[PDB]
Design an enzyme around this catalytic site. Structure first.
Site, mmCIF file in Angstrom:
data_model
loop_
_atom_site.group_PDB
_atom_site.id
_atom_site.type_symbol
_atom_site.label_atom_id
_atom_site.label_comp_id
_atom_site.label_asym_id
_atom_site.label_seq_id
_atom_site.Cartn_x
_atom_site.Cartn_y
_atom_site.Cartn_z
ATOM 1 N N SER A 257 -9.893 -1.030 6.921
ATOM 2 C CA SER A 257 -9.264 -0.800 5.612
ATOM 3 C C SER A 257 -8.570 -1.985 4.959
ATOM 4 O O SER A 257 -8.153 -1.892 3.790
ATOM 5 C CB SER A 257 -8.294 0.382 5.657
ATOM 6 O OG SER A 257 -8.972 1.595 5.335
ATOM 7 N N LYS B 64 0.832 -1.201 0.000
ATOM 8 C CA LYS B 64 0.000 0.000 0.000
ATOM 9 C C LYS B 64 0.868 1.252 0.000
ATOM 10 O O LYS B 64 1.891 1.311 0.675
ATOM 11 C CB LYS B 64 -0.925 -0.021 1.215
ATOM 12 C CG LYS B 64 -2.073 0.963 1.133
ATOM 13 C CD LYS B 64 -2.985 0.795 2.296
ATOM 14 C CE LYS B 64 -4.017 1.866 2.315
ATOM 15 N NZ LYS B 64 -4.854 1.706 3.527
ATOM 16 N N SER C 135 -9.766 1.598 2.736
ATOM 17 C CA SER C 135 -8.843 2.330 1.835
ATOM 18 C C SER C 135 -7.844 1.497 1.035
ATOM 19 O O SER C 135 -7.376 1.985 -0.003
ATOM 20 C CB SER C 135 -8.099 3.438 2.586
ATOM 21 O OG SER C 135 -7.500 2.943 3.762
#
Ligand SMILES: Nc1ncnc2c1ncn2[C@@H]1O[C@H](COP(=O)(O)OP(=O)(O)O)[C@@H](O)[C@H]1O
Ligand SMILES: [Mg+2]
Ligand SMILES: [Zn+2]
Lengths: 478, 91, 410
Positions: free
Chosen positions: A171, A72, A147
């Site tokens: 997330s 990420k 996210s």
């Protein structure tokens, strides 16, 4: 087809020289080129660089020897851009590696790219990426979640086998649910937050996405453990999870929170979840109703705590030491206020305003301090329920993956995606989302919340579930 | 909630809001503030604010660690001069 | 006089640690800009603070030396504001729940009376960096960002510009004796912000408060205060009201000035740093620091008066400048003639070193040499007249007293 192979299949092949690290990377690289135009999982693909790093990779007994891994883009990878999917940090070149990236590198892993996200990891759909939306590989009219959208998605299409995300209020889990993949957020303190661009320090945790429980258990073992560079990381030994997932503990118990019955669920989700529980019952799990009298308060609590910490943690993006700086300004004040208005996205700006309100004197007591107290009430619900039960189960999400633009109208509609996920972050508990069904063509996640430090059990049940329901065989985009 | 409020909060936060944002954030923030206003119901006199469990405070010996190379420390800087970060003058 | 000055001080004391407060970068004066610097102390994304143990230990020691109650639990809080020398957009300090509270310092006044000034708090916090202005730009050196500070706040117990200076001098000397900080304003190791109001004599109400910032020496705080007290008395007796503001002091003019900018302070949005657990200080550790406390100036003062029979004038000199007392005691060890040694130290050596501009730590005359010289005077080997000639050349050269006695005839 190689990219179609698990890390166990890949390891045996790599250890006996039947394949080389370079070929592995090449395989996933191709699958990347097959998929990326539709999916858009990455901000910065680094397959090219991983190819070169693979040539010098030789010691085969390294636990993640030839394994590609997506990361990420709020986790710092040295020498490459870490954008957090923000204008304020495009062109920010990371001067150091997150502790987890150091540990993966040392274990032979090959970082294959920086994955798309909601800007600064705030959102539930990835639409708030300042650059572009990532799309759900099972229906490109649908969101992959957020996210960690791109980390879930890339694991789903198998443009990488395994992936790192972060989880502040769901997330990892939510995206795992939406993309039909396994995703875990470990106990708060199990994995270092050194090099993790902080959103809510008291809530953030790096976690792992994979398609097989062993893949996830191994990556987690590698990255977990005490870090001296992180004051909040626990001095607790990391369990040998790769050796532990395959074991079976008898007479485990599952709690179904009564307060969750009052939660609006889509019928498809409800049906899929009931069946998950029935099938677990058949395998000998005792199923019990539990009470969490305060859970309903999780959302309000989270949306005071998270914005607050976020306004504090984002104070540093200022045009002074790094990143974006506005072109026109008459003063330091204008430099500051223009850099930030221009560099930050709307959801981010929203939580900054809300945060600086909740911390303002005169409102701090009724907002942040209050919330931190209700947060202990909610944690205590869990500790008491864990006296009777071993894991707590629910759907990961109240709905099937939703459409783009569907929850951008009112910001609040986005928040309501998190209703089943935020309680675990509040209580600091580990929680996993595993795929339990496919309904109307779309993945559905089942969630298990465990006791502090009990990732083992979460992982074990995940391993047993996949043997019954082989979700790792469902591959999107052919 | 007021325009005055939005502007005061954005000042504190160093956001120079564009006129489009001031109006949108008026409604959105009002809504969110109504949305999260559920907690008064609960009694929290006699509740300790949440902290994670820990036995002792984590501390570190007073021994120097190698600093960051100044080149790497400054590389990302919008403007640099002679080893210094450069910003518009302050009074 | 009709009125009364009420004075409180806010002192930031730099801790003599090797390392910064929240990372392992070096604390040192005059390094190349941005060399002792860090992902952590640079406020880089992803970077986390780690508490310095010696910083903690020193701050407890300082608290005790200031007679404070040390609180077994205290909390680091974030203090938010935007400024180029503050990398994170916040300063980590303490707020509610500081380390220490309810202490006191004793002042010895010229008239011979002793007074107390209360310490309201002592808390731990990190420093900001430093700005240099050059043309239309500001240049930022973050070498100092994250350096440990003790913020020490006084109650408004000070009554006089002289008392303010005397307070500051005693605070410095306690810090030095305790070994926690060098505490010289010259090197930025001690900062002081002054708060002052006036009050009809014997009143219990508090007058409107003016804050004077960046006064850079103990003498300058006296001067700033001297003028400001006059200024406020003028205003009040002219029928005017004294207005609450921050002011500056110009050393060159000896005057205090209001500021051109009507810039009000902004909410600090204080809350416990969530990157850090509460500072838990075991009773056993307080006990251990208490038991092993270095000797403090008021203690040393009575000890010398006893152990050596010095006058209050003599011991005061030796205690107010610690290194002079240290010299004395190392000399008295070589030759047990205390009265003779203080005489020759105070009346002769000190003045000779002052003239050459050399500190007592670095004097050519070592404690051995003074003890030796005073030996020759006592044993009647040489005369005082000759003794004063040889001490001058001892300072000039560095040779032993016996060396130059031989070299020039007994
Ligand atoms: N009326 C006054 N006259 C002189 N000094 C004062 C007065 N009021 C406060 N102070 C001093 O100012 C410092 C802190 O002031 P205070 O208002 O208590 O805290 P702060 O303004 O920092 O929040 C203390 O040293 C205190 O003694
Ligand atoms: Mg301070
Ligand atoms: Zn540092």
């Amino acid at each position: 087809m190689l990219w179609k192979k698990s890390l166990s299949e890949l390891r045996e092949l790599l250890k006996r020289g039947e394949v080389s690290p370079k070929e592995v990377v090449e395989s996933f690289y191709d699958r990347y080129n097959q998929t990326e135009e539709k999916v858009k999982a990455y901000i910065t693909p680094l397959y090219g660089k991983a190819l070169k790093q693979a040539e010098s990779l030789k010691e085969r007994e390294l636990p993640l020897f030839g394994i590609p891994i997506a990361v990420k883009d709020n986790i710092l990878v040295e020498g490459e851009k870490t954008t957090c999917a923000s204008k304020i940090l495009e062109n920010f070149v990371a001067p150091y590696d997150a502790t987890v990236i150091e540990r993966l590198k040392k274990a032979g892993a090959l970082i294959v790219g920086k994955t798309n996200l909601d800007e600064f990891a705030m959102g539930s759909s990835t639409e708030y990426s300042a650059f572009f939306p990532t799309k759900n590989p099972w229906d490109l009219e649908r969101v992959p979640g957020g996210s960690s959208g791109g980390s879930a998605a890339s694991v789903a299409v198998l443009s990488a086998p395994v992936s790192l995300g972060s989880d502040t209020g769901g997330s990892i889990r939510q995206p795992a649910s939406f993309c039909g993949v396994i995703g875990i957020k470990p106990t708060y303190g199990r994995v270092s937050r050194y090099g993790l661009v902080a959103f809510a320090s008291s809530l953030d945790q790096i976690g792992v996405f994979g398609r097989r429980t062993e893949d996830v258990a191994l990556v987690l073992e590698v990255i977990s453990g005490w870090d001296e560079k992180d004051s909040t990381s626990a001095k607790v030994p990391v369990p040998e999870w790769s050796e532990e997932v395959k074991k079976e503990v008898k007479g485990l118990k599952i709690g179904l929170p009564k307060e969750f019955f009052e939660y609006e669920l889509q019928p498809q989700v409800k049906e899929a979840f009931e069946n998950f529980i029935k099938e677990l019952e058949k395998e000998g799990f005792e199923i019990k109703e539990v009470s969490l009298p305060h859970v309903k308060y999780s959302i309000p609590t989270y949306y005071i705590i998270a914005p607050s910490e976020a306004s504090s943690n984002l104070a540093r993006y200022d045009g002074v030491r790094y990143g974006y700086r506005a072109k026109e300004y008459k003063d330091i004040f204008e430099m500051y206020a223009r850099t930030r208005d221009e560099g930050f996205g709307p959801e981010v700006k929203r939580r900054i305003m809300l945060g600086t309100f909740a911390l303002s004197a005169g409102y701090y007591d009724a907002y942040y301090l209050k919330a931190q107290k209700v947060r202990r009430l909610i944690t205590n619900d869990f500790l008491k329920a864990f006296e009777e039960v071993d894991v707590i189960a629910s759907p990961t999400t109240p709905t099937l993956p939703f459409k783009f633009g569907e929850r951008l109208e009112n910001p609040i509609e986005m928040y309501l995606s998190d209703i089943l996920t935020v309680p675990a972050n509040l209580a600091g508990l580990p929680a996993i989302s595993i795929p339990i069904a496919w309904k109307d063509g779309l993945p559905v996640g089942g969630q298990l919340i465990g006791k502090h430090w009990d990732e083992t059990t979460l992982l074990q049940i995940s391993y047993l579930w996949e043997q019954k329901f082989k979700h790792y065989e469902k591959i999107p985009l052919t | 909630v007021d325009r005055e409020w939005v502007l005061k909060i954005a000042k504190l936060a160093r956001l120079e809001l564009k006129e489009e944002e001031i109006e949108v954030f008026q409604k959105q923030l009002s809504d969110i503030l109504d949305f999260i206003d559920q907690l008064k119901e609960l009694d929290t006199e006699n509740v300790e604010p949440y902290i994670q469990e820990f036995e002792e405070t984590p501390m570190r010996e007073d021994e120097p660690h190698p600093s960051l190379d100044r080149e790497k420390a400054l590389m990302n800087a919008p403007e640099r001069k002679d080893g210094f970060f450069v910003v518009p003058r302050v009074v | 006089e009709k009125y009364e000055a009420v004075i409180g001080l806010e002192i930031h004391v730099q801790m003599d640690t090797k390392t910064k407060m929240f990372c392992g970068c070096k604390v040192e004066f005059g390094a190349e800009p941005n060399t002792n610097v860090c992902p952590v102390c640079l406020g880089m994304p992803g970077a986390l603070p780690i508490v310095n143990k010696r910083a903690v230990e020193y701050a407890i020691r300082a608290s005790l030396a200031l007679n404070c109650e040390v609180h077994e639990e205290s909390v680091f809080a974030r203090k938010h504001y935007f400024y180029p020398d503050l990398p994170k957009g916040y300063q980590i300090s303490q707020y509610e729940k500081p380390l220490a509270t309810n202490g006191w310092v004793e002042l010895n006044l010229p008239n011979g009376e002793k007074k107390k000034v209360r310490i309201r708090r002592l808390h731990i916090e990190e420093d900001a960096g430093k700005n240099i202005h050059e043309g239309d730009k500001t240049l930022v050196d973050l070498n100092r960002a994250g350096t440990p500070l003790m913020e020490i706040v006084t109650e408004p117990d000070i009554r006089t510009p002289e008392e303010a200076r005397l307070f500051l001098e005693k605070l410095r000397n306690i810090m030095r004796y305790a070994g926690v900080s060098k505490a010289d304003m010259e090197k930025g190791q001690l900062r002081c912000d002054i708060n002052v109001s006036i009050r009809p004599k014997g009143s219990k109400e508090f007058g409107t408060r003016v804050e004077i910032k960046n006064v850079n020496s103990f003498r300058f705080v006296q001067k700033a205060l001297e003028y400001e007290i006059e200024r406020q008395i003028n205003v009040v007796e002219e029928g005017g009201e004294v207005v609450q503001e921050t002011r500056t002091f110009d050393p060159q003019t000896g005057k205090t000035y209001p500021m051109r900018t009507k810039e009000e302070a902004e909410d600090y949005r204080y809350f416990p740093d969530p990157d850090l657990v509460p500072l838990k200080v075991k009773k056993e550790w307080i006990e251990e620091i208490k038991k092993n406390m270095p000797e403090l100036p008021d203690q040393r003062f009575e000890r010398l008066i006893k152990e050596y029979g010095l006058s209050e004038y003599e011991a005061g000199i030796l205690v107010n400048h610690k290194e002079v007392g240290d010299f004395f005691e190392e000399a008295v060890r070589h030759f047990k003639e205390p009265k003779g040694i203080v005489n020759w130290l105070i009346n002769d050596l000190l003045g000779l070193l002052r003239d050459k501009g050399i500190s007592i730590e670095e004097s050519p005359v070592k404690p051995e040499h003074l003890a030796e010289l005073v030996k020759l005077i006592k044993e009647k080997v040489i005369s005082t007249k000759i003794g004063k000639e040889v001490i001058k050349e001892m300072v000039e050269t560095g040779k032993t007293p016996s060396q130059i006695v031989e070299e020039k005839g007994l």
